[PDB]
Structure formats: C-alpha cells, structure tokens
Write a protein that binds this ligand. Structure first.
Ligand SMILES: CC(C)(C)NCCCNC(=O)c1cccc(C(F)(F)F)c1
Lengths: 123, 122
C-alpha cells in the first residue's frame, strides 16, 4: 500500500507573518518545494520545505519559546520529553526552574528555528 | 460612559472558514476592526463581528477541545479553575470530564457563529 513519505510526519513549521515555527504535521507533499501543513490548532495552509524543521521531538538542549497564559516570548531550554497517554510533553527549563508543557505550547522564534535548520531543515 | 475593550480577552476567528481561538484585543483599529493577539503570538486585524467578548467561555457552551491528534473533539464547558494564574476548563465528553488549558479550548466555525448574537462585537 502507501509507501512511507513525508506525509504524516510531525514537524515544526514557520508562520510567515511573524517568523515563528509552530507544531504541525505534513498532510500533502504538493511538489515544487510546497507542502500542505496542518498546524496543531486545526488550521491548514501551504508551507515551503525550507521553512519546515523535521523535529519530532525537538531535541534536548534546544532553546525554544514556551507558551503559557499571558506569555508569548518566554525563552527556555528543552531538558526532556515524554509521552503521557499518547501525547508528547516537553520539560522546559527557565532560570533553574522546570515546567512540563504540551507539544503544541512549544514554539520557536525565527532565531531559535534557524539554529536547527542545518541539521533539521526538510529542504 | 465609554467602553473600550482593549486588553480584554476574547475568542475570535481570523480566517474566513476558521475556528474561534483564544486571544486578546490589543488595539481598536477603526472601521469595525480590532487588532487581536492570539495566545500563540499571532497578531492580526479582525472584524468585530468575528470577535466574541467571552472570558471565561460560559458554562454549557459547546466547544472543541484540542489535544494531540484531536482536531474535532467536541465537548461542553462544565467548569473552570485557575492553577498558578492559568485558566483551565473542565470539558465533558460522553459523560466524562477532563481539564484543558485555555488555549486548547476553541470554537468551531459553527460553534462560534452560534454565539455571535449574544457576545459578538459586531
Ligand atoms: C499561527 C497559527 C496558524 C499556528 N495560529 C493562528 C492563530 C490562532 N491559533 C492559536 O491561537 C493556537 C491555539 C492553539 C494551538 C496553536 C498552535 F500553536 F499549536 F498551533 C495555536
């Protein structure tokens, strides 16, 4: 049947308006460097392969941004990841304190995502 | 006598066929538009009719609760509480209740259309 392809892979992919990379999954390999991306909020749009990071999970010791109520730019460092009942969580350290976050709350600024492009950029 | 909703939390639709997502009004732009900061950091202008001035989402509202690989899971708001300054909703689905963080509780296109009359800023 279907041969494994990039379809169905979980990734973090760049949002053009603000340059941040958000958790999502590739739903279609459209061709010519374009992909259809389903972000974890249910929104789907086209994203270029150069703007997709093949991170599932984001690796240890990565600088990331962790969303929480009324906080949009909280930088932290990945210190672990675990699955709790089919859901990925990240352990994020900030100034010697740790909180566990669901996958979709962990995003990357442009600068944070660029640190991962060489190793993890799709195309 | 004047009301200004800048700084207040809302649930709002930014794309023509989109869901309504948790956010905050950051500016009254004019022409029936407001600048919206969604909880994920995306900021854009939104028509007032697509903004629901709800915080918290009311008891017994039909909602959609996000979780990994769950995009359409409908449920009903049955309670809410703050844990360390963060709102969580108790969501009932098929007679069982689970707690979800605010940003994960969204309204489908139709679920939001249905509150526009009472809570919409149109
Ligand atoms: C930029 C982007 C298209 C992803 N969102 C647009 C603004 C509305 N979405 C949210 O506020 C939201 C809610 C829950 C989860 C997430 C996600 F980060 F996981 F995608 C996002």
């Amino acid at each position: 049947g279907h041969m494994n392809s990039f379809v169905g892979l979980r990734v973090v992919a760049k949002w053009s308006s603000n340059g941040y990379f958000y958790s999502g999954k590739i739903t279609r390999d459209v061709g010519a460097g374009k992909y259809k991306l389903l972000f974890d909020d249910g929104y789907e749009c086209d994203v270029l392969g150069k703007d997709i990071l093949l991170c599932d999970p984001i690796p240890l010791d990565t600088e990331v941004t962790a969303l929480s109520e009324d906080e949009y730019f909280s930088a932290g460092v990945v210190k672990g990841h675990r699955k709790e009942s089919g859901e990925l969580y990240y352990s994020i350290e900030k100034e010697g304190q740790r909180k566990w976050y669901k996958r979709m709350a962990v995003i990357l600024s442009l600068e944070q995502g660029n640190r991962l492009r060489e190793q993890y950029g799709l195309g």
